[PDB]
A paper describes a structure:
In addition, we produced single, double and triple mutants with individual and combined exchanges of the SONOS bridge residues C22, C44 and K61 including residue Y54 that directly interacts with C44. Interestingly, variant [name], in which the tyrosine that interacts with SONOS residue C44 is replaced, shows a similar catalytic deficiency (19%) as variant C44S suggesting that both residues are required for full catalytic competence of the active site. To define the structural basis of the markedly reduced enzymatic activity in variants C44S and [name], we crystallized both variants and compared the atomic structure with the known structure of the wild-type enzyme (X-ray statistics in Supplementary Table 1). In the case of variant C44S, we were able to obtain a structural snapshot of the covalent acyl intermediate formed with the C-terminal glutamine of a symmetry-related [name] molecule as previously reported for wild-type [name]. This structural analysis reveals in both cases small structural changes mostly confined to the active site, notably of residue H41 that forms the catalytic dyad with C145. The structural changes for K61A are clearly more pronounced than observed for variants C44S (0.89/0.91 Å) and [name] (0.24 Å), highlighting the structural importance of K61.
Author numbering:
A (entry chain A), B (entry chain A): 1 to 306
The structure:
């Protein structure tokens, strides 16, 4: 029993982190096979970041201008190219610690673990969600760029995020491992609007199911609702609309607990309209939305990895 | 910027987890050098756990009755002994992935990371605190016994916790790596009282300092207090008393933010007396107490590990 925000074990990703230095800029890179992936802004000075022309800046850089260090050993760079907002440095040695992996572009509302790193070295691991407005609420300081987010399925690491920017609002933006930003953000130090940060309704419902499984039941009510009725409430509270796809994803949790999805929706509706009257659910005094239905099933059944 | 409950990278501990089977009971063990540590209840059936005589039960077990499996390879057990509530299985091979390590018995209110494992395989990592009543609020299912908690200092893993029991209240109890339980608990399936779970005041104050550092300032008030005045309030709300030792530990955070410790105490006092009026601090609608002052400094400055 118990329910905790839980990250994937980070060991397979630890063995992939390196330090990349170009000129006087140092950040983190991801070493898989004979390629090192890192944010293209590694080629920028603080001044360049105000209005960079990455193509023109990269024209000045040769292979030998990119220092790549893994632990205390130097990798030889034999090729470089820019793909969207990431650089790919071809090195002469395949990472012997490369796990089985793939690159995935995740959907808003999905979750993933972040291994925060500085100077190529791991600092910590935490769980977070791609917000509906395509930001993440992370914990990143200067030098953390190139940190990656990932999910693990048994022995295979799906990399989904590389950290690039902190918006002036303090939230974070970054790319997939092909270098395409999530959301409308650019790798330039300019004001950028994220947009309304809505709550991930299907995740809140999964977490309520998790609460029931663990004995937190007080919020169950005698009401039901309909999808359209519930969604009228959701709109008012800046919750994402719930679709039948979402209902389908919640099916197994509905089955396990015997609580129809729409009954749980009606319990969520009363929570949105009446608040939590100073009570808590799974140790939280607000509705948590950074657990997916799959996260709940995983944690509640003890799925392991290599 | 940003502030997240963050665990240590788990890779050094992943390489130490093995599966231990005795008869029909399987749980996790920790393989360091040529010794495997695991809960002594591995020798018990579900029936034995009602009223075990561990000495008498262990007398029946020989080295060859303990199956130890690391990945898909079997370790040869050449000796066994019981130390308090842990078994130590001497094996014929030193773990080649053994990190630098020590065993530490932590104080109530300290934090540590837990690598939850099943059948010797890692499932996830999360951060938690040794409560003042010597329980932890973890996420553990059947088979998770032998999971360990740890801290990391650069390249050295300090193991501080091994999981043994879930109390009927749903909270968790376990031992240090010498096998001595934290708190009054025993490894028997009987009712056991934890006692009043108080809030870790010094950790709440560190977290308030973390909030200020990140721009969450609304809770700062115009008041100050004294240690005795504050502690009268703390007693009323089941907060641990604050000592001058705690004030000293908060000194660097006081210095960084320019907020005297007792001024922050007065802000906490008003929060306890008036609640949070539906506001949040660092994304939480209650006062968080599972960050130590050292955790705040670490995260706010980006300390890394090998």
């Amino acid at each position: 029993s118990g329910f905790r925000k839980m990250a994937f074990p980070s060991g397979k990703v630890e063995g992939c982190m390196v330090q990349v230095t170009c000129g006087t800029t140092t950040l983190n890179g991801l070493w898989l096979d004979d390629v090192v992936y890192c944010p293209r802004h590694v080629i920028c000075t603080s001044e360049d970041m105000l209005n960079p022309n990455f193509e023109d800046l990269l024209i000045r850089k040769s292979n030998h201008n990119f220092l790549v260090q893994a632990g205390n050993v130097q990798l030889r760079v034999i090729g470089h190219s820019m793909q969207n907002c990431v650089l790919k440095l071809k090195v002469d040695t395949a990472n012997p610690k490369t796990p089985k992996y793939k690159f995935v572009r995740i959907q808003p509302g999905q979750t993933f673990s972040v291994l925060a790193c500085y100077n190529g070295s791991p600092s910590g691991v935490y769980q977070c969600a791609m917000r509906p407005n395509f930001t993440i609420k992370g914990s990143f300081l200067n030098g953390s760029c190139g940190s990656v987010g990932f999910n693990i399925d048994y022995d295979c690491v799906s990399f989904c995020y590389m950290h690039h920017m902190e918006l002036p609002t303090g939230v974070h933006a970054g790319t997939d491992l092909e270098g395409n930003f999530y959301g409308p953000f650019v790798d330039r130090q300019t004001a950028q609007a994220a947009g309304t940060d809505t709550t991930i309704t299907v995740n809140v419902l999964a977490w309520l199911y998790a609460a029931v499984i663990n004995g937190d039941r007080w919020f169950l009510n005698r009401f039901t609702t309909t999808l359209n009725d519930f969604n009228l409430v959701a709109m008012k509270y800046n919750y994402e609309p719930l679709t039948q796809d979402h209902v389908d994803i919640l099916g197994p949790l509905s089955a396990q607990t015997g609580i129809a999805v729409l009954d749980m929706c009606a319990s969520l509706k009363e929570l949105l309209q009446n608040g939590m009257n100073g009570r808590t659910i799974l140790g939280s005094a607000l509705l948590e939305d950074e657990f997916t239905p799959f996260d709940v099933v995983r944690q509640c059944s003890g799925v392991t990895f290599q």
